[PDB]
Every structure is written in structure tokens, then in C-alpha cells.
């Protein structure tokens, strides 16, 4: 039993991480065969990238794998990321894929500096396609990344932080998530929701690990739910998100509309001073899948 | 910006996890030059250890390391681990040290079910000598652990848990954490307290990230602070802990005691709805290392 912020194992994204220095910026990038990615914006000198990186030869780009001088060949910019082809293919590259999640879903996120990596943690796209991570000066080029058996999903690469200090990327084929662009003029996080189903998730998870106090004798329609929710601006639950929470719902006895009575009261009444799971507070960035994955045992090599 | 509960990078120890087998019991162990290290209570079938390892031989341990057999030719018993020596040397072996933390300390947990690694997380050791975990039937074994530069310094292995849900294991050279001891007979966990000098650390980590509503004008001395902690089950605050928070405390413009006064009343008014770096609860679980490790930027390799 307990209960954590779970992150995937790293070592494989570990060694995938390089330093890509050009100009004066230098910042960290993704070495998967013999291609390195990298958000463009370490081209030198409001910008035209096109304009900018036909300026460009080869010999400008520096990468840095350890103690190791990566030779580039060839480049190309594809959205919002550079692709640098180096005349070396990364020995330690992992089975993988590129994946642009929705918002809701959760990923580990491997903080990095000048190459090397500094910490790694669970984050989720909001629904306003910001990401809350913790992220200083030189952490451009970080991934995130989910792992299935033995393939690394990379779905998030950090570009920057948005004045209320939430961060904003790409996927990496370079495609931000949200409205923002690659340039520094002036972007705002939109107003951000709580992710219902998530939420529901969670409290299942309590109810796996033993703790009850929340539960009630009501029901609720999927309809009557929304209502409450829209109110305590929590994202509407589908037929598609309950249909999610099933294997939850089976495994602890609970129909979901019967949680969400129960979520119903937590919104109404507050919590009274209680926990849940060690929290004062309805958390909301573990999925259904998440829940799962703790409170089974799935390994993954 | 931004603060997360941050694991080091894991990839160093997950070179090192491996599935030891004996018997019906099947438990993880750690691969270190030419030895193997896991709990004793693999040992076939209240015990007595020495009486139960005479009685093996070496080919009764069968050590998997990925798809490869290990040959086990030698053992031995170290308190609570057993050393199985193998006739191959780990080549990912990491540069490394045991060390035996103080309660308070923080380690990441890489938790591991048959050898594969699946999840990492942040953990404290808890004033009692327990660590709230999230574990599994098929953990034991699995090893906490603490990164600087490119050392690992293992500090725990996982055993037991507890009736209330939360874990007691060793040092890596098989001293308990507590007065714990490994059969299945009656063990409770100690009375906990929350590690004050940790929670003075994070609102430091608040102030530097930019949330101010909690400071205020008044200051304590130790004495009268620490009068009212032990009202609210908080550890006394040590001279050595004030010293500790110096560098914090000087990049933040606070003195210690100042922070003292502003814990002081969070104590005795609550949060009336507030938050603090995302939580509605007074967080232990970050060292004064941990939050200058993460507001500032460092790196290991
Ligand atoms: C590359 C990098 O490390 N990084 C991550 C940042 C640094 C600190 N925390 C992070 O997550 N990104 C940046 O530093 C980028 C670099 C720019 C990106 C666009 C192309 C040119 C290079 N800068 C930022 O993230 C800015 N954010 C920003 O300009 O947002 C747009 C904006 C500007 C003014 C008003 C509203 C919106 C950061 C560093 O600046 C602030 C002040 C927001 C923290
Ligand atoms: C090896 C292993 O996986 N593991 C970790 C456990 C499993 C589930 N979550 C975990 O963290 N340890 C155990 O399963 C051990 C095995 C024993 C250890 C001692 C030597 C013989 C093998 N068992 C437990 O952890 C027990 N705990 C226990 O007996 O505590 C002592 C006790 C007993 C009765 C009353 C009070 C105190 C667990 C599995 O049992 C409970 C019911 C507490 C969960």
C-alpha cells in the first residue's frame, strides 16, 4: 500500500540526453539515432526562423554527448524543433515513439541542464495546455516522456515559462501544446480547470488503500454531476471518462455516478479538516491509468 | 520556477537491479562489482537465520539479471542482507557508497518488482524510522538512494510493511531504520512528529518562488518557537538546524527565526484557505539541500 507521485524509471531517456551549444545559446537536446532535436530558438539573432537558419552551416552547432564531440551533418527545422543529423548513431537509444497526448494525461518530465540531468518528476497537460513543472535558466530541450514495457513515448520537449511561472512546450515533432508561439512578446496561460476524471481516479485510489470517510448513500445522474461541476469549475465528465473508470469501479464495488455523488459532497462541503491519501486537496494529476499502474504492480523493462 | 517533489535521475541503480530466487520466494537485489545484496528472508522457510543459511548451498540462489543466469558462488549474512558473491562483475556498476541517513533525510525510491524497475519517487525517513512508500506484494529489495555528482549513496532497502500502511527496511549493510526487526510477529510504528527545520526549508522554497502572504512582522526566539512547536507535535528546532537554514535564510533576506515567527502563527491560525506551492498542508518532506539542489540548478553526472 501507499500512495505516490510516481514517476517512470529515466535511465533510458538518461542516455539520450545531449548539449547542443550554437551562438551564444546553449541549451539541451534529444540524440535518438543518429538525429538530435532541439527547440529551434537556439539559432542566432521577433525572428524569422526560416530567414535565420539558412544563415546557418553546420560547423555553428556544437553537441556535447558526455565527454564526446557529436559531429552535424546535415539540419532541418520541422515546426518548432531543429533536427540535427550528427555522423553518429546513439548506441543507447531506446525503442520509441513520438506521441501528442491530450490534456488530462500525465508524463514524467526529466529535468536537464547543459546536458545533463538534474531531477525527474510527474507532471500533467492542463487543460490549457500549460504544464506546472519546476524549471530554471537552461532547462530548454527537457523531455517528458511515459514508458510501455520497454518503448519510451516522448510526448513533451520545454520551450518556456509564462509569467504566472506555469511552463509551455512542444511535441517533439515541434508542435506547440496550447496558442503559444516561440517568440518573447506577450502570451498568458488561459484560465485552467480542474480534470474531473482524474479527480475520480484518485479517489478510488483512497478507496484501494483503505480509506472510506468520503464516501455516501447517494446517487447522482451523469447530467445533475455536470451541474455541480461546472459550478466549482471542474472540466464536464463524459460517457467516454466513466466508461474509463470502469475496471476502478469493479475492482472496489463502487458505481462511478456513485463517486460522484460522493465528489459532489467534497466540492459542497469541503473537507473538514481530513485527508485524503495525505492531501488537503482534491488532486488531479493522476489518470485512471495511473491509479492502475501503482496499485497492481506493472514493471516495465 | 516552479517546485516539484523531485527524484534523482534513476538510471544508475536501475543497471543495477536484479530477480534473486529461492526456494518459493522471489524477491529484487542489488548487483554491485561481484555481489549481490537482498533481504535474508529469502532464505527457506519465527526463525533463526543462521541455523536456516547453514543449510543452503550456493546453487539453491538463482540470481536473473535480465535474460542472463548469474552463478552464485559464494554467500554470506550481514545482519539483516545476505551477499550472495557471483562469478561476474556488474560493468554498469556506478561509482558508489553505503551510507546510514538521519531521520529527517530525504532519498528517491526506485521501486521494483521480479528485477524490473517500475516507478521512482521522493521519500523521507520519518522521526520514527518509517518511510511512507508505496509498495507492493514482491518490493523487498528494491533500494533508496541519494545522487552527488556522479556517486550513488544507497541509504535504504525495503523489507516490511506495517499495519498502518507505512515501511520499514535497512541500510544496505542490513541495520534496520528503527527497532523493527525482520519476522512476521507484532511491531507497531512509533508516535510520528513532523521535521521542522524540512518545513522551515519549504517556505523558504515558497519565498524564493514568490509566495510572501504567510511572512510577517513578528520574530521569536528559539526557546518560545520551540514551546510552541512541541504543542503542535513538531521536532524541538536545533541550533545546528537555525545554521543549517543560514544560506537559505541569507539568499531570501529572512532570518531563521523571523521564518520561526511566520511558522509559529501558520501553526495556531491555520491556512484559512490558502495554499503554499500547491498544498493546503505544512510540508516535511524537503531538506534545506533538497530546495537549494532545486532553485538553483545542480546537476549530477
Ligand atoms: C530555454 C529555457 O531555458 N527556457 C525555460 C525557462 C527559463 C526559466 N524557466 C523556464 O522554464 N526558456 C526561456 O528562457 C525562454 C527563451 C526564449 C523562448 C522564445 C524564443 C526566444 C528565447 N524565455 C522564456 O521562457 C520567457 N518567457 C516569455 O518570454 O514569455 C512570453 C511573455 C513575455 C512577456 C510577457 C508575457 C509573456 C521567460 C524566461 O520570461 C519570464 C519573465 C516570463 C519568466
Ligand atoms: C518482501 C515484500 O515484498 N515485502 C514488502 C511488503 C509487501 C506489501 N507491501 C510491502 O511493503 N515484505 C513482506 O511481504 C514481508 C515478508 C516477511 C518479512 C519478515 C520476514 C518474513 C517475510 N511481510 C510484511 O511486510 C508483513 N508485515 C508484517 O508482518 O509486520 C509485522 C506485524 C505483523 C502482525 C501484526 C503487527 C505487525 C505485511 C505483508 O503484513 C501486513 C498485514 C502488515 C500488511
Same mark, same amino acid.
Given at each position: 500500500?501507499?500512495?505516490?507521485?510516481?514517476?517512470?524509471?529515466?535511465? %533510458?531517456?538518461?542516455?539520450?540526453?545531449?548539449?547542443?551549444?550554437?551562438?551564444?545559446?546553449?541549451?539541451?537536446?534529444?540524440?535518438?539515432?543518429?538525429?538530435?532535436?532541439?527547440?529551434?530558438?537556439?539559432?542566432?539573432?521577433?525572428?524569422?526562423?526560416?530567414?535565420?537558419? @539558412?544563415?546557418?552551416?553546420?560547423?555553428?552547432?556544437?553537441?556535447?554527448?558526455?565527454?564526446?564531440?557529436?559531429?552535424?551533418?546535415?539540419?532541418?527545422?520541422?515546426?518548432?524543433?531543429? %533536427?540535427?543529423?550528427?555522423?553518429?548513431?546513439?548506441? %543507447?537509444?531506446?525503442?520509441?515513439?513520438?506521441?501528442?497526448?491530450?490534456?488530462?494525461?500525465?508524463?514524467?518530465?526529466? &529535468?536537464?541542464?547543459?546536458?545533463?540531468?538534474?531531477?525527474?518528476?510527474?507532471?500533467?497537460?492542463?487543460?490549457?495546455?500549460? @504544464?506546472?513543472?519546476?524549471?530554471?535558466?537552461?532547462?530548454?530541450?527537457?523531455?517528458?516522456?511515459?514508458?510501455?514495457?520497454?518503448?519510451?513515448?516522448?510526448?513533451?520537449?520545454?520551450?518556456?515559462?509564462?509569467?504566472?511561472?506555469?511552463?509551455?512546450?512542444?511535441?517533439?515533432?515541434?508542435?506547440?501544446?496550447?496558442?503559444?508561439?516561440?517568440?518573447?512578446?506577450?502570451?498568458?496561460?488561459?484560465?485552467?480547470?480542474?480534470?474531473?476524471?482524474?479527480?475520480?481516479?484518485?479517489?478510488? &485510489? &483512497?478507496?484501494?488503500?483503505?480509506?472510506?470517510?468520503?464516501?455516501?448513500?447517494?446517487?447522482?445522474?451523469?447530467?445533475?454531476?455536470?451541474?455541480?461541476?461546472?459550478?466549482?469549475?471542474?472540466?464536464?465528465?463524459?460517457?467516454?471518462?466513466?466508461?474509463?473508470?470502469?475496471?476502478?469501479? &469493479?475492482?472496489?464495488?463502487?458505481?462511478?455516478?456513485?463517486?460522484?455523488?460522493?465528489? %459532489?459532497?467534497?466540492?459542497?462541503?469541503?473537507?473538514?479538516?481530513?485527508?485524503?491519501?495525505?492531501?488537503?486537496?482534491?488532486?488531479?494529476?493522476?489518470?485512471?491509468?495511473?491509479?492502475?499502474?501503482?496499485?497492481?504492480?506493472?514493471?516495465?523493462?
Amino acid at each position: 500500500s501507499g500512495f505516490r507521485k510516481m514517476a517512470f524509471p529515466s535511465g %533510458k531517456v538518461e542516455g539520450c540526453m545531449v548539449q547542443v551549444t550554437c551562438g551564444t545559446t546553449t541549451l539541451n537536446g534529444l540524440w535518438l539515432d543518429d538525429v538530435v532535436y532541439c527547440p529551434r530558438h537556439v539559432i542566432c539573432t521577433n525572428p524569422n526562423y526560416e530567414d535565420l537558419l @539558412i544563415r546557418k552551416s553546420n560547423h555553428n552547432f556544437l553537441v556535447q554527448a558526455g565527454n564526446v564531440q557529436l559531429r552535424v551533418i546535415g539540419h532541418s527545422m520541422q515546426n518548432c524543433v531543429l %533536427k540535427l543529423k550528427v555522423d553518429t548513431a546513439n548506441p %543507447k537509444t531506446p525503442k520509441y515513439k513520438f506521441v501528442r497526448i491530450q490534456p488530462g494525461q500525465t508524463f514524467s518530465v526529466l &529535468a536537464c541542464y547543459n546536458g545533463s540531468p538534474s531531477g525527474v518528476y510527474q507532471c500533467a497537460m492542463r487543460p490549457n495546455f500549460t @504544464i506546472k513543472g519546476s524549471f530554471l535558466n537552461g532547462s530548454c530541450g527537457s523531455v517528458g516522456f511515459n514508458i510501455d514495457y520497454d518503448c519510451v513515448s516522448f510526448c513533451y520537449m520545454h520551450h518556456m515559462e509564462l509569467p504566472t511561472g506555469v511552463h509551455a512546450g512542444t511535441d517533439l515533432e515541434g508542435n506547440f501544446y496550447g496558442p503559444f508561439v516561440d517568440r518573447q512578446t506577450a502570451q498568458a496561460a488561459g484560465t485552467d480547470t480542474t480534470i474531473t476524471v482524474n479527480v475520480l481516479a484518485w479517489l478510488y &485510489a &483512497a478507496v484501494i488503500n483503505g480509506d472510506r470517510w468520503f464516501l455516501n448513500r447517494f446517487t447522482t445522474t451523469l447530467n445533475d454531476f455536470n451541474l455541480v461541476a461546472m459550478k466549482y469549475n471542474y472540466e464536464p465528465l463524459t460517457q467516454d471518462h466513466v466508461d474509463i473508470l470502469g475496471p476502478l469501479s &469493479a475492482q472496489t464495488g463502487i458505481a462511478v455516478l456513485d463517486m460522484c455523488a460522493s465528489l %459532489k459532497e467534497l466540492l459542497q462541503n469541503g473537507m473538514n479538516g481530513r485527508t485524503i491519501l495525505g492531501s488537503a486537496l482534491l488532486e488531479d494529476e493522476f489518470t485512471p491509468f495511473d491509479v492502475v499502474r501503482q496499485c497492481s504492480g506493472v514493471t516495465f523493462q
